[PDB]
Design a protein around this ligand. Structure first.
Ligand SMILES: NCCC[C@@H](C(=O)O)N1CCC1=O
Length: 325
């Protein structure tokens, strides 16, 4: 299982966190840059224990590849609106407590980033089920959302994916799976590691970025430091052609399966995924279309490393698509 340090019980911080949220702009999408500036001020006033846990994780990730915050001050279910059924969100939608947490905790880590072609270029995404969801969509439910490093094929791939839960699914069945390369690497033979490392392989892109044009990107499954590598994996989109490459990726795929951990998000939970050292998935659940379907809020965070940033960026920036080559 995950380490002790990987789960942070924030229940004791509830009143302090609500106080920070009370000073944020109530209609964030009317002025997202100013909203996130206010959240950056609040980030410096986080309770010391929570600030320290975030800073430690930010420095170089962890063996588990994620940080789970629990007990954040989510609204009671009947004080939330109905779960969204459309994207993008209305510009005048009032701020919800778990969105405020994504703002403050997100700015403690880095810069919120939107992607112009994805969900209308918005920064805050609602993750909810839809009845006709494409099999690669985070709006899936009954079909498994397969392992993916988020936007691994994108030059401006973010360091973190952050998921904040306002509603779990009714049966609390849906598991967010995290596969950490730090756990998977010991299971991969040195010979296979050597084939994977720094080797660009053809990779398709998600629907939002297709302008099916095929494998228009090149992704290195392992890269960076060979003794502590970064991971770029997508079970559906990575398309190795050479039989050795196909074989090496299959070994990596089975290793990530073997070490994957299941996180079942409940209201008030916030999951920070190290998107340079993990791949993540979501297991099946059955929506009910009753107004209370599963509802996460998702943002992407860039940090100043791995050429994510080149100068002048602000939290709230929306960037254009460029495939890794
Ligand atoms: N197969 C997982 C991709 C899910 C998809 C979505 O938002 O539905 N996505 C995150 C970036 C992007 O496109």
């Amino acid at each position: 299982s995950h380490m002790m340090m990987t789960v942070v019980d924030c229940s004791e911080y509830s009143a302090d966190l609500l106080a920070l949220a009370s000073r944020l702009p109530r209609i964030p999408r009317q002025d997202l840059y100013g909203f996130l500036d206010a959240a950056h001020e609040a980030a410096g006033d986080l309770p010391e224990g929570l600030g320290t846990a975030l800073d430690r994780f930010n420095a170089d990730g962890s063996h588990d590849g994620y940080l789970m915050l629990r007990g954040l001050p989510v609204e009671d279910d009947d004080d939330l609106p109905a779960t969204p059924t459309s994207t993008p969100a209305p510009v005048d939608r009032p701020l919800q407590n778990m969105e405020a947490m994504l703002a403050v905790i997100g700015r403690r880590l880095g810069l919120h980033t939107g992607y112009r072609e994805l969900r209308s270029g918005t920064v805050y995404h609602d993750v909810y089920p839809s009845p006709g969801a494409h099999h690669l969509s985070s709006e899936t439910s009954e079909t498994l959302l397969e392992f993916h490093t988020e936007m691994a094929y994108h030059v401006l791939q973010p360091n973190y994916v952050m998921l904040a839960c306002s509603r779990a699914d009714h049966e609390r069945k849906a598991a967010t799976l995290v596969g950490s390369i730090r756990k998977a690497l010991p299971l991969i033979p040195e010979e296979v590691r050597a084939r994977l490392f720094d080797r660009p392989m053809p990779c398709c892109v998600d629907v939002a970025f297709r302008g099916n044009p095929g494998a228009i990107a090149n992704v290195k499954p392992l890269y960076g430091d060979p003794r502590d590598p970064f991971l770029g994996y997508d079970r559906e989109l990575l398309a190795p052609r050479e039989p050795d490459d196909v074989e090496a990726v299959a070994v990596l795929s089975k290793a990530l399966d073997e070490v994957s951990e299941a996180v079942r998000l409940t209201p008030g939970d916030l999951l920070v995924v190290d998107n340079f050292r993990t791949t993540h998935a979501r297991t099946p659940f059955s929506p009910r279309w009753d107004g209370k379907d599963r509802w996460l809020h998702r943002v992407y965070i860039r940090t100043d490393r791995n050429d994510q940033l080149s100068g002048g960026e602000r939290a709230g920036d929306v960037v254009d698509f460029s495939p890794r080559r």
